[PDB]
Design a protein around this ligand. Structure first.
Ligand SMILES: CCCCCCCCCCCC
Ligand SMILES: CCCCCCCCCCCC
Ligand SMILES: CCCCCCCCCC
Ligand SMILES: CCCCCCCCCC
Ligand SMILES: CCCCCCCC
Ligand SMILES: CCCCCC
Ligand SMILES: CCCCCC
Ligand SMILES: CCCCCC
Ligand SMILES: CCCCCC
Lengths: 271, 278
């Protein structure tokens, strides 16, 4: 983040998360194709490694910009269809509201106002409410979030986050429902290498969990990622854009200490 | 030993270091007077090469009920030093101190915030200096005896990173192997092994990027009796080092040392030390 606008609470510490999460894709062979990116068509076909289950997905996205609207369609192989309507920066400079639906309810309305040093958020779920608030002060970041159930009239979760970040170095911490502590350090050495460190421990248990990850970019269109943790789990991640259109991702998981591993492959056609 | 908590970054490879550093004290005659709640530790040392004399008066008193520790430092030259330490009050593994000192020499203060835990050992340093404030972080992880540590010093005056140090090592009480890289151009390794209760061994390794030559050292500590021990060290720079320490009675220990320039007639050094404990 190089702007004066703080990210959303859910997007807090995304840089370190991208080092651990993205670039791997274990235990799934998925084939995705997005086109006409404008009417945005997106096809997704993922096959499972453990259960050998093949599930498909076809996504359409009508987006026309001047009035700030974006329609969304997503139907999967086993019928479950949802629509998403979102207007951006029309009723106010930093206003944004969405509308959700599903098919066999799960309708949702999500409102969020962003400004310089401030990024509030509120979500209406159909019957719970989730409110979020993130404040930025000279590179620092503080955040709070509360999920409220309307029927029980009781707060479900309460997360409080503090952190400091730049485009080169990020540190974030958060407490989930009071009993869960989590921390993540992200530091990029150069344009070609990225490295993140993860920390988490639950209140009431003395033990903790830590993990390290890497993201090494050899060529502009070929990079490598590797992660590990104290649970004797290893993860390798490879990616090579074969040509501008198609982009291949091969990865593997190794169980350091029965003896079942995981292997992942991914192709990303783009026309 | 092999406690669940990893050590401080600066404390990585302390078992090997102690075989070299402690038990010697060359070229200095020192007299320490430790006294027990509060603690008044009086120190008086005289240099052998320049015949200068310094005497330090230290006052410390801890408060176990609230984890507080007060510490005062003052020497012959009018230099004052103060330190306050709180432990395990705001959190279980939390610890944070505040140092303050000035010398009629410069004046500076710093706050050192460090959180140790099972398998973790976090530590941060907020240092306010005359030149510029300096922020120094340190994280050390432990996985089944393996230790991986990192440390950075950040000169905040104008955004720059002063030193970056990456260190890995496998540590058990019977065998401690450690390696570190400093500033990306300096490498250093230590091999600590204790043969038995009576003998300890350490090996030192060091070489700099851009120079073919290396520097190594071998040390040893042999403890003849419960009240007497012997030390020895030698490096590839032709420097022999001996030391003898004997507890004469419960409250006193005597330390004799000598540094002998092995090859090329150079100035030799001799050390003597007393440690009254009362
Ligand atoms: C923190 C480093 C984790 C390394 C784990 C790799 C798995 C191999 C470990 C074999 C002993 C359990
Ligand atoms: C770096 C953050 C350190 C915060 C300490 C949290 C305390 C964890 C709970 C342990 C029992 C009090
Ligand atoms: C020029 C920006 C005007 C901002 C008004 C929007 C207020 C949203 C209140 C939550
Ligand atoms: C663990 C302490 C976190 C403080 C980070 C220091 C960043 C300030 C640089 C201006
Ligand atoms: C964990 C942060 C250590 C301080 C480094 C600050 C660099 C801006
Ligand atoms: C525009 C078609 C909407 C279908 C959603 C039920
Ligand atoms: C500053 C918020 C931390 C809460 C600890 C229970
Ligand atoms: C507890 C964090 C201290 C860092 C001061 C900037
Ligand atoms: C704590 C050492 C691992 C951090 C990435 C170099």
């Amino acid at each position: 983040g190089s702007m004066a606008v703080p990210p959303t609470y859910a997007d807090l510490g995304k840089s370190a998360r991208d080092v651990f999460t993205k670039g791997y894709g274990f235990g799934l062979i998925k084939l995705d194709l997005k086109t006409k990116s404008g009417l945005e068509f997106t096809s997704s076909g993922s096959a499972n490694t453990e259960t050998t289950k093949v599930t498909g997905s076809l996504e359409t996205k009508y987006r026309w910009t001047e009035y700030g609207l974006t329609f969304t369609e997503k139907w999967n192989t086993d019928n479950t269809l949802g629509t998403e309507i979102t207007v951006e920066d029309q009723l106010a400079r930093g206003l944004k509201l969405t509308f959700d639906s599903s098919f066999s309810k799960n309708a949702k309305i999500k409102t969020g106002y962003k400004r310089e040093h401030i990024n509030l958020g509120c979500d209406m779920d159909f019957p719970s409410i989730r409110g979020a608030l993130v404040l930025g002060y000279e590179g620092w970041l503080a955040g709070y979030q509360m999920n409220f159930e309307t029927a029980k009239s009781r707060v479900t979760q309460s997360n409080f986050a503090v952190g400091y970040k730049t485009d080169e170095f990020q540190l974030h911490t958060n407490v989930n429902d009071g009993t869960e502590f989590g921390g993540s350090i992200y530091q990029k050495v150069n344009k070609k290498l990225e490295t993140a460190v993860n920390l988490a421990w639950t209140a009431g248990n003395s033990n903790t969990r830590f993990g390290i990850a890497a993201k090494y970019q050899i060529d502009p269109d070929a990079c490598f990622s590797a992660k590990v943790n104290n649970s004797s789990l290893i993860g390798l991640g490879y990616t090579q854009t074969l040509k501008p259109g198609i982009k291949l991702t091969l990865s593997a998981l190794l169980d350091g200490k029965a003896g079942g591993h995981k292997l992942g492959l991914g192709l990303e056609f783009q026309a």
